Enzyme design. Structure first.
Site: not given
Lengths: 188, 188, 188, 188, 188, 188, 187, 188, 188, 188
Positions: J84, J114, J141, J159, J179, J182
């Site tokens: 997208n 860096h 997104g 998202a 994290k 399930r």
């Protein structure tokens, strides 16, 4: 009387702030912009633009770009008028140009007079002083012609002249201010 | 002799109506149009155009746009020539410019003389008067240099000067007409 | 001190060859190029460009194209400044313009002085001479204002003038060199 | 001697790495690019470009696009030269073309000789071998003319010829290598 | 008879100076210019241009740009014609191409013969020699086919060939001049 | 095996009608179109395009426009490769080019072999024959290199040659067909 | 017979859905689009486009933009043809125009007939009816000429006329439908 | 008398072949082309073009594109004139339009009469018949107004009308030919 | 009610001077402008523009350019609608078009009624009269359909008709005014 | 080792100041700029650009503009990858994407690390951490994936997640830091 009618009647008028005059000047600036951005090779297009600008069919009127004018329609031209680079016909006051006229580069024909008093000038007031350029004349480059001035037919204006006063016919005139040097023999 | 051959030989010639000369002027105008519409950022392109115009590989010749010239190939340049905005090298008559020359804005180098008699002038006749600009010179802005004039090396021309006659070397000259004020100390 | 710091401090500096100054001049030429190629009809775009050039929000500053400036940010403007066609504000030295100022076409405000000695001039050295244009002033067309000159408020400069020296307030001044003709009655 | 001076004197020179020569080639490529992207309908523009390229006013020199040249100014042309599509005048060595010359499509006139030894060649060295094309000649398509070759006046070169050696006047020559077949009757 | 009627009748005609023929060639060059400047991605546009050029609805005629032709309407095509980069169909004399034809890059099909005598050639005279390319043929790259030549169906022309004389059907031909090597087994 | 896998394995494959191959050729044609329409002055853009075309960061690979290639990614280049105008690397079969290679104008490196029998050829079948161009080589203009050919390092190919067979290292070879003339002394 | 061959033979054909015909019409639309977007100042370019459109070298054929045509190659022209603004030569059926013809603005020369029955019409069927415009004729503006119509030489068609039937030579004709008013003395 | 002077005096004149008239029509066609290609969003530009076309500052004259006119300067307009899409003011004969006029789409105001005799017509002869459109009128779409016709003030012309004869004031008129149906009550 | 609500309710509304309606008309003119300047080759772009105009996903709605509409969103379409060149859907009043409709060139569907009294009309007032075009219909070229008219399904309208009154279904109707000629046999 | 060789070997390298790497990034930026300025309607052109960017023939890789990448050639893609708007594949470290991958808008896949110490970071040093995106994955997104991270096949990233550590296969993971919530049932 409208401000355009006062301008044409040679009366004091609001040149700077009248919407009609600002808009008529815009039209001339738009046509000059198109002309100034037309390749020198586009001969027919240049001819169409100069004709649209002066609102007349010109007869051998050559204009070297850039060219500037305030209204365009207030420039009355004869046949065979040769205008070099960077000329400005400030035509609030009618600018009459005869036949067979050679105008050098960087010449200004100014018809605008502002009041000397800043109170009236800051209000936008101006008086238009028409310029009469006789037929068979020659202007050197870097010449400025002031409001109300008449340059007689057959006359020659030297380069760098500031024409403050009328110049008689068949005369050679030079300087800042522009003064007659001698008469010209214009016999066949 | 062709009209181009007469121009170069400093004889009277039909500048305005000879097809060859009208066409050679077109080429210079087309290159000047391309130059005048090239973004200042386009360094390589400006260099290519300046070189095509003068028909030579220039050595540090800086030209601030707009620039105008009649032929281009009749402008002979030295190295380190700094030309400010709105200059015109009217080069029917050769314009020779030395090395290390500072030309201010709105300067005109005019080599064209028209007849004083309107009958000969209306026929398109002109006489080309070559201009010689010495090396190590400085021109203020708004300067007009007239046909046949020579400005000696090491000389300084004040702003607004109309150079009607030759200026000797190492001299400070100002005015309309341009007159020498004093000599310049040009020692190391 | 950098060459920019020397320029601003009114000391001799390398104007022609310092990379920083060459690059700051490029920015002004790029903005001027965009402005000079913007159709007169594009009012908002012209306002944005004028404002980006001077690095300020202008208050009724009208500029007729083409316009030229060296830095743009070294031109200090008042409200109601009317600039006609082909003006050049050569601003290495600050150019201060008051309120209600009428600048005619083909005017140059020059702040750059080059050395008279060609050895120092060929090295790229210049000295910036700031120009002060008082409020309520009027400049005719074809005027050149020289480095360090101050034109007093309420003053009028005639067309074709070369302003070499300071003009006092409420005075009418004309010529090359520019000389006071008479005082002006600027009362209500 | 500069590398350009060595090129013109027919001495070994750095063609590939000399900045002046790389820059002069750039100018010819820029003009050739403009020509190659000009619509066939734009007759005046093509003429202006062809004239800027060769640095001369051509007399009936027809060039069918694309066209290529290294310098342009080192191609000396006569009147009435008809150049078909995809021709290349590699002009480090002068290419002299007479009057009334018909050049077919996909023809190459090569004046560059590289050393046979790779050590000298990899250093960028070349020797320019001028080509002389006589007046009143005809070249078929797919012809390659090699360095130093002279094609005598009144001669005809067959299609697909590789002209390695000089062709005498009034001769019909064909092949790879190009060999004379018979003489031509060129009487009125 | 007009010069176009003489061209088509295989008679001597003024190819170079007849206005009608110069104008018909212009049309083909304008269409070829549009095609040569059309992105390869614009499939439909390329098809439309190819069809406008040949004045026919083509059936799987692939053309790799650039392509050149003199008239376009004098090229008679079969279905499945594969034309690689930089081909020129000089079609004053009809060019007949069969079905299933593979034309390599840099191939020229030339139908124009000029007189050997320079007096007649300088007058613009030419004689058109039609080319017949049989169906099921293959042309290598860098091939030149000369006026009046017929390449028989099922034939193969080697790369770099200069086809001066007719090639019989089902033959493998190579060289400058093009000579038959052996017959081809074209059985199922 | 896909038709691309057969092409790379040097087996007969459908070059003309496989969608994947037609689409991979489109990508190379699109990048070549962009390159061919990039002004010679746009140095960084040309470098980006040539790098995108060959799918590698080139080290002094000069390409004079126009340039053609079928895939681009099947051209393996060394450093210092000088390619003159109108070259075509037909790379269905890998084209390996060493370091320090001078390729004249109008050269074609062809790796495509079509069947001699029209039945198999009309089906779109081809066999790719890789070309090996040794380091330190020089190609004259108008040269065609045929499929499977190896040009040994230090070799020179004369103008107009049709290289049908392998050329040994340090050899001077010329003609159609290309034959070794003599060995080259390539010592320091 | 192909649908193009049926069109030219004056038989019923699929005008709307045949790919060949849709593609030949596209070519004419692309050339017309180029012509309609060419500045009036570009004289040589306009001449090249008109010639590419009609597939012929025209002799004083003036066309005021915009102009429309279906095929262009099915318009047969004489010398001195003056076509004013917004004309459409719908040329599935050949449109023959003589010499010295003045065609006013907003004129349509239509050769396409659709079936009256919607079942056949919805299938895309058409029959081409050729139009013959005689030499030395004058068409006023806003004129529509219908399929199969012949306008005799020396004739004048009044402005706003709908020419449904054949007009004889040297006649002044006006109206919707177009009817002869009087003969013209052209001697 | 010139052909333009005869046109304006309502006498027979060469409209089709007089160079001056062909050139004055070109100017109108060029301005109409610029107007027809100006995005509806560009309000100020459309106003400038309409004003340049009619050679007057219009007062609420709305024009829906495309618009066509022959001269432009021979259309005399009142204030509040609403012109829908695809209108043509064929103005060889003056077209006078009053105030508050609604002109529907696809309307033609034709002032040109050609001779009935083909001999005189083929010579290019025409007679201009001026059209007078009264103030407070309404024209439906698809209306054609013929030469010399006067439509009285307060009148309504039905859609599809062909106005062959004068229509009196305050009348409802429809048909081909246009005939009065009934009078209109135009009281406050 | 707003002026838009008054328009949709078939009431008298200020069509010419309501800001909202003026702005919604501008959106339709901007989309129509983009579509009228889209090359016929750009199939998907035309589809996107047609769908954006009508605010619907069209099903075989072919529109030949130029096309005009007032709102776009007030034109209700069916499947298979064939619109020839220069058609105008003036849709202040809803235009309903069924399935399988053939609309010839130069057709106008007009829904705008202005008052007959000039005092009310000059105020900008209009009344919208929806138009209903039945499925399976055919319109000849040069047809004008007037406000409030229903054309029955299966009907045929002759070229040049002025549809002032309702046409029953399955009817052939021709003329100004449009009148039924005969019923149509619309059996399978 | 070159800085590009160190980058690919996962060693510390000068990313910011190595000319080769700056130039390889330029090529990707130029192709991304062309893609980002290609109309969504130009399907074939978008496909060609995407293929030139990734240096591969993609199989249903949809990219919604704008798109950003550093090298392009270091993004390894599977078939059916849906990207997208506003995604950035910072690919100094190889980014491997499997088959059937849904990438939401505003997602960043960052492979650049860096140094934490400003002394080493200011020197331009970076270490590339390759990213492995398993087949059959879905990214919401506003997701940022960090260097060295592996997202197991069949996994779903919520998202706004900031993926700092590896995510096992067939897992639903959300948050900043990301994290596992399930496992997912991915059976047929």
């Amino acid at each position: 009387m409208t401000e355009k009618e006062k301008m044409l009647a040679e009366k004091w008028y609001d040149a700077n702030f009248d919407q009609t005059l600002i808009n008529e000047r815009l039209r001339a600036k738009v046509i000059c912009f198109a002309l100034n951005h037309t390749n020198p090779v586009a001969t027919m297009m240049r001819k169409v633009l100069i004709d649209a600008l002066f609102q007349t069919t010109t007869d051998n009127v050559s204009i070297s770009i850039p060219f500037d004018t305030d209204y365009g329609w207030n420039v009355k031209l004869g046949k065979n008028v040769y205008v070099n680079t960077n000329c400005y016909f400030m035509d609030g006051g009618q600018i009459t140009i005869g036949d067979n006229v050679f105008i050098g580069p960087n010449c200004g024909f100014y018809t605008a007079t502002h009041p000397l008093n800043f109170h009236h000038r800051n209000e936008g007031f101006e008086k238009a002083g028409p310029i009469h350029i006789g037929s068979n004349t020659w202007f050197g480059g870097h010449v400025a012609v002031l409001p109300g001035v008449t340059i007689g037919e057959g006359s020659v204006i030297g380069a760098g002249s500031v024409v403050t006063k009328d110049i008689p016919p068949h005369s050679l005139a030079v300087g800042n201010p522009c003064k007659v040097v001698r008469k010209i023999d214009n016999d066949l």
